[PDB]
Design a protein around this nucleic acid. Structure first.
Lengths: 73, 205
DNA sequence: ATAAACTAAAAACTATTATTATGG
DNA sequence: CATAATAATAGTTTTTAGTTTATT
């Protein structure tokens, strides 16, 4: 219980801000509409492609790859 | 809110920059608070301070265990509930640093504070009431050391008016707080009858 | 001058549904 | 100006007051 004081202060609502809370919920909802629109438009695109091999850099191709690395692709 | 405390806060910051009961005057203030005679002006000054200074005396809060509790008990400024909840939040912000299970003084202080809060726990509001309930749950499940259940004030809280309109549900949620603990559902000790104690339950049922 | 039905039975029991007291 | 909400509304059967049509 470390956030317990933080839980207290975040729940210090007794300045009677019910209308303020609902308005904050409203603004959050509008931003959620915007962000959701953006996310939907983004995800219709092809998702990021997954790889299947480790890789190393040198002056030569490293033949030390394993059978798994070869056949998973 | 407190405003003259700002230099005190600067003092705390400076000392913690420079910083067992190694005295940087917390012996002086330790005595200044341990007495339940310290004036409410100075009492609340020290209270707000130690709220803001809980971090510095972690492997010290056990010695601070008794003051805060006796500070917590029978609190009599911005509001009694305000400082009560703030200080108990500070106390439970540590759990292994100190426990009110040593001298029976802290144990009885904790029990008396429990009675105070369960007397006080209610809101016309929704969450902050449930926030208090969760406060009770957190304290009982972080100590579980000397904590004992009255069941009597509890009984009248949940037995209620035989509600044609929901009111005693506060006592029901208190029972649920107990239920979250592995504590006995109701000690069949004397109580009042130990049999109808559940007849009132099934009545409100 | 209407004794049958003249004409449509004013009304709750016992069952559901949109309200918002609020949840956030 | 959003959302597990919630509940005051309504709608079915009874049984009164309207009325024809002979009835003398």
């Amino acid at each position: 219980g470390r956030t317990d004081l933080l839980r207290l202060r975040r729940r210090f609502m007794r300045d009677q801000e019910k209308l303020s809370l609902m308005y904050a919920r409203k603004g959050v909802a509008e931003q959620k509409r915007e962000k959701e629109i953006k996310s939907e438009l983004k995800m219709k695109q092809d998702a990021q492609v997954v790889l299947y091999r480790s890789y190393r850099h040198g002056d030569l191709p490293d033949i030390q790859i394993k059978h798994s690395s070869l056949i998973t692709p | 809110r407190h405003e003259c405390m700002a230099p005190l806060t600067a003092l705390v910051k400076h000392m913690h920059r420079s910083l067992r009961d190694l005295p940087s005057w917390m012996k002086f203030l330790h005595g200044k608070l341990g007495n339940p005679i310290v004036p409410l002006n100075i009492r609340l000054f020290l209270a707000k301070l130690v709220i803001n200074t809980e971090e510095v005396f972690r492997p010290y809060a056990k010695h601070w265990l008794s003051p805060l509790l006796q500070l917590a008990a029978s609190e009599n400024g911005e509001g009694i509930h305000y400082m009560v909840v703030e200080i108990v939040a500070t106390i439970l912000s540590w759990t292994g640093l100190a426990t009110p299970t040593g001298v029976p003084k802290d144990e009885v202080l904790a029990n008396r504070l429990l009675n105070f809060l369960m007397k006080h726990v209610f809101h016309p509001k929704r969450a902050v009431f449930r926030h208090n309930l969760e406060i009770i749950k957190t304290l009982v499940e972080c100590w579980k050391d000397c904590l004992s259940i009255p069941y009597r004030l509890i009984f009248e809280k949940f037995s209620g008016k035989d509600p044609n309109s929901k009111d005693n549900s506060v006592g029901i949620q208190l029972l649920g707080i107990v239920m979250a603990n592995d504590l006995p559902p109701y000690d069949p000790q004397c109580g009042i009858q130990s049999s109808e104690y559940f007849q009132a339950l099934v009545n409100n049922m």
